Amino acid sequence: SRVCQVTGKRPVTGNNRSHALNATKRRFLPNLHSHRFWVESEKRFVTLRVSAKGMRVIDKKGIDTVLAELRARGEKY
Amino acid sequence: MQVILLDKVANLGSLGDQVNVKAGYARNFLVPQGKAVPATKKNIEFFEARRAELEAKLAEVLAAANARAEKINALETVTIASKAGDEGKLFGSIGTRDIADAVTAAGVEVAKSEVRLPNGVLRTTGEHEVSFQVHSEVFAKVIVNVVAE
RNA sequence: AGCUUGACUGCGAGCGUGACGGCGCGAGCAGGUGCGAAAGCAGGUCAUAGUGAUCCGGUGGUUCUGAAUGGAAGGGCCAUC
RNA sequence: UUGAGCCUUGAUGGAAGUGUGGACGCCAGUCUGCAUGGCUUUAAUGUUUGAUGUUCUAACGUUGACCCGUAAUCCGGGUUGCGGACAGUGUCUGGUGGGUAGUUUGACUGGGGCGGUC
RNA sequence: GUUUAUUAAAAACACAGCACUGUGCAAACACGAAAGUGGACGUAUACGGUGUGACGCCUGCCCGGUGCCGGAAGGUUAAU
RNA sequence: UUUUGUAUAAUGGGUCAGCGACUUAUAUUCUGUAGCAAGGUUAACCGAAUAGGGGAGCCGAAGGGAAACCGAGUCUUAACUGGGCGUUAAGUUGCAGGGUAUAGACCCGAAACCCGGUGAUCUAGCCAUGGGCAGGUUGAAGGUUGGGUAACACUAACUGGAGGACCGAACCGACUAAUGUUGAAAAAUUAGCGGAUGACUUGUGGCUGGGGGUGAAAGGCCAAUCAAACCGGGAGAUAGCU
RNA sequence: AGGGUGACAGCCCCGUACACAAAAAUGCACAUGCUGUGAGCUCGAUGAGUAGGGCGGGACACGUGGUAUCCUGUCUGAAUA
RNA sequence: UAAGGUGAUAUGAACCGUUAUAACCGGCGAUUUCCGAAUGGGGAAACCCAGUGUGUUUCGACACACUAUCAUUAACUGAAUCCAUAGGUUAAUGAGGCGAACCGGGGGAACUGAAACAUCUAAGUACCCCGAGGAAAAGAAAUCAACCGAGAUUCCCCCAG
Ligand SMILES: [Mg+2]
Ligand SMILES: [Mg+2]
Ligand SMILES: [Mg+2]
Ligand SMILES: [Mg+2]
Ligand SMILES: [Mg+2]
Ligand SMILES: [Mg+2]
Ligand SMILES: [Mg+2]
Ligand SMILES: [Mg+2]
Ligand SMILES: [Mg+2]
Ligand SMILES: [Mg+2]
Ligand SMILES: [Mg+2]
Ligand SMILES: [Mg+2]
Ligand SMILES: [Mg+2]
Ligand SMILES: [Mg+2]
Ligand SMILES: [Mg+2]
Ligand SMILES: [Mg+2]
Ligand SMILES: [Mg+2]
Ligand SMILES: [Mg+2]
Ligand SMILES: [Mg+2]
Ligand SMILES: [Mg+2]
Ligand SMILES: [Mg+2]
Ligand SMILES: [Mg+2]
Ligand SMILES: [Mg+2]
Ligand SMILES: [Mg+2]
Ligand SMILES: [Mg+2]
């Protein structure tokens, strides 16, 4: 499931629109990446499948907090 | 990604300075490997409460015994001396424990030769006021009375 | 050949000719103009082909409009592409 | 290494003699430094800012080897080796693209087409 | 040898042989939004594509057009 | 019925009985009709429920101008001798009808497009595992021994047992004719015919699914149909045609 | 009201209007108990990878228009009564 | 509740009843083979085969119960790596499937209309998919209005084709 573990970001649907303005169904889908993060709080590499942005979020909120969610949401990690 | 520093660190480092580095270097090396930390604002005081409770706190906590020479601003009782010689002139020197002899009962008792004047120590009158090692900054003032016997 | 810009602007009794969109002829009125001593003539060319609706859009003019109010954008109106 | 800015120490805006590289030097100068002797036209650094190149490793790749979960040709964790900010993927973008898709491809006409016409 | 099972069995398809062209292996190619998998437990004396079509004697000229291959000057040229 | 025209040798109907096509909803206009009339009328809702309440609102009594605006006038233009559109005729709300609009809009009828399912019990190709090929010929390589060479070469007997090899039943196919063609049979029977140790043939089970498969390639085959299967749905597709 | 009864029934039968009924299990109301549960005052605090923005699409009756408002795949990114 | 009864085609038989345990109706219980989510493993549904506990003056054997997966919790265990995570057994709870419509969300056609057709339409329809309730969803203003004011959401009639 192309789904960002931290932001929820899943793929969406849209049209293409040519010059002719012709609709063709299509997908935008997240820039995911699954990165190995260090925790220190757990002496371990928890390795989430994140979207950049998802990344930028960790970079702000902090991993202990992002992993705080998920834990609190049900998710594995 | 600004982040504040822990250890030194090449082209930015400074044990706590305010850097602004590329995000990767940080979340890929600097942090998670102990060396820096997100400048989480919570922190810019957490690591600025030091730049004040220290560089302006413990740099003032030093000043509590000014010059160390406080009420000793009127010299000290001359118990004995520091010696003499050359039938009129001077001859003898200060053993690695012989500048106390006179001021030998004032402050706290010690016995070491933290020499300050790397000269042949001038041999004349007697009483002199240089400085001696009282600390890495301040000084002190007393005199030296000889002994006639 | 001389002088010229009537190849004018607003209108228009009344007719033609079209299923219609439209096209055409028109004396006369007002303003203002050219030629003529004057009567007068001139709203292109002897007439009849020489063309392309609507939309969208451009450009000038014009406060007519203009979403709280004042402006402005955009819209209208006239001119033109 | 390199294009350009700023900060600077040397150029345009403790004497005289016995001595040296670079030079628009008004065409023939004098210099700019080299030894001594009782705000704007110029060179190097500290740098700030981009370009280019080496290498590094720490993202990331491993369809090499090993350890464990595990009597397992999956997976995951770990170790090690090779590689490496490349490759790849997301968004955006120019090109190619009958492979696929939706369609168009007029009327008159002594049948239709052709010709011709509108 | 194959073929239109039910109007065509052939001169059509296939064929061994030949050539051209792709592919250095996580191959190209192919099924598949992926994961996985065929190629292949193969590795250029192999594997795909295309055409020709045992064998004998042979296989000339043409690169303008179309297609394909290569080109680190310039002209033109997208997001930004 | 269709036609310029049909006894027409042009359509349709064997015959009877039953069924079988211009409807309904909401708007909207006109006529008829009824009420009230410079007015008419209420919607939802309330409700003492076909009453009554509710006048929100709708239409009409005023037009002109793109409009600001002016107003029985107004616009045109500086202004019109004028010109255009207006002032001079009552409306409105039910009820029935005639039209129109939106809906399947008078009834039946395509070939098709799209979605989601069911099918490799026929058939193509492949995978696994099993079975089958009477009888009769030809006689490769190799081997042995002789003769042969200086030695090889060569050569004769014999031995041997190859082959998408030959003839021919089983088995697999399907070239010709006749019969049949409301058949014995929705593709056969009969007499002849090709293959028949191979790229053979066959049983059981498996895999491939529809713009897909599979195809020694015919657009062949995919359950008596395939230039895109079958079932169900969109669906009363659309039908300026009959 | 309606139905049945050998043809059409107020008065034959079942019904009907009306008036009554549950040992049990349940529904809903309340009045209580149990477990909770928090109430009121004062003093605070007041929702950032967010709003906004570039790109691409999609929603708004509005088909990028002169196009505000909303959602977000991608890249970014404030103020703090 | 009762003087009649043992459902039907469908009689007949052998019976049960008549003042309260005939029958009939209703509340609460018991029983409820096998298959089916089907759940001990398997499987061509209604069949094959188990493991562990039990259990028999005939304790061979054969009857009875328990053993699916997943999630939260807990106890006990426990790698690479020594702590620790991972893993492992066990236990208690829960889920699972079915079924009308309405409802919220994920995805999303085409014929057709435009008298061809591509923007546009059909239509966010059909259809697939997930989730839930008696309803759902929405909801108490960073909403409107317009210099006066209003004061959440939902639904109806108007505004207005
Ligand atoms: Mg095509
Ligand atoms: Mg024609
Ligand atoms: Mg043959
Ligand atoms: Mg045939
Ligand atoms: Mg034949
Ligand atoms: Mg080949
Ligand atoms: Mg050929
Ligand atoms: Mg005829
Ligand atoms: Mg006749
Ligand atoms: Mg007839
Ligand atoms: Mg088979
Ligand atoms: Mg043979
Ligand atoms: Mg035969
Ligand atoms: Mg034969
Ligand atoms: Mg053909
Ligand atoms: Mg068939
Ligand atoms: Mg069908
Ligand atoms: Mg339809
Ligand atoms: Mg039909
Ligand atoms: Mg707030
Ligand atoms: Mg079972
Ligand atoms: Mg089972
Ligand atoms: Mg179409
Ligand atoms: Mg159409
Ligand atoms: Mg609710």
mmCIF file of N, CA and C (backbone and C1' of nucleotides) and ligand atoms in Angstrom, chain H residues 38-39 42-43, ligand 22:
data_model
loop_
_atom_site.group_PDB
_atom_site.id
_atom_site.type_symbol
_atom_site.label_atom_id
_atom_site.label_comp_id
_atom_site.label_asym_id
_atom_site.label_seq_id
_atom_site.Cartn_x
_atom_site.Cartn_y
_atom_site.Cartn_z
ATOM 1 P P A H 38 -14.510 -20.028 7.578
ATOM 2 O "O5'" A H 38 -14.951 -21.147 8.639
ATOM 3 C "C5'" A H 38 -15.123 -22.496 8.237
ATOM 4 C "C4'" A H 38 -15.606 -23.373 9.364
ATOM 5 C "C3'" A H 38 -16.107 -24.742 8.928
ATOM 6 O "O3'" A H 38 -15.136 -25.770 9.093
ATOM 7 C "C1'" A H 38 -17.606 -23.740 10.504
ATOM 8 P P U H 39 -13.852 -25.909 10.078
ATOM 9 O "O5'" U H 39 -13.455 -24.605 10.905
ATOM 10 C "C5'" U H 39 -12.168 -24.768 11.504
ATOM 11 C "C4'" U H 39 -12.111 -24.479 12.988
ATOM 12 C "C3'" U H 39 -13.262 -24.999 13.845
ATOM 13 O "O3'" U H 39 -12.778 -25.278 15.164
ATOM 14 C "C1'" U H 39 -13.197 -22.627 13.932
ATOM 15 P P G H 42 -6.407 -27.439 7.280
ATOM 16 O "O5'" G H 42 -6.899 -28.663 6.377
ATOM 17 C "C5'" G H 42 -5.921 -29.566 5.886
ATOM 18 C "C4'" G H 42 -6.531 -30.828 5.333
ATOM 19 C "C3'" G H 42 -7.501 -30.656 4.183
ATOM 20 O "O3'" G H 42 -6.862 -30.396 2.955
ATOM 21 C "C1'" G H 42 -8.373 -32.209 5.695
ATOM 22 P P G H 43 -7.434 -29.241 2.039
ATOM 23 O "O5'" G H 43 -8.780 -29.881 1.466
ATOM 24 C "C5'" G H 43 -8.680 -31.106 0.758
ATOM 25 C "C4'" G H 43 -10.026 -31.768 0.582
ATOM 26 C "C3'" G H 43 -11.131 -30.937 -0.063
ATOM 27 O "O3'" G H 43 -11.049 -30.930 -1.480
ATOM 28 C "C1'" G H 43 -11.964 -32.027 1.857
HETATM 29 MG MG MG I 22 -11.587 -26.135 7.111
#
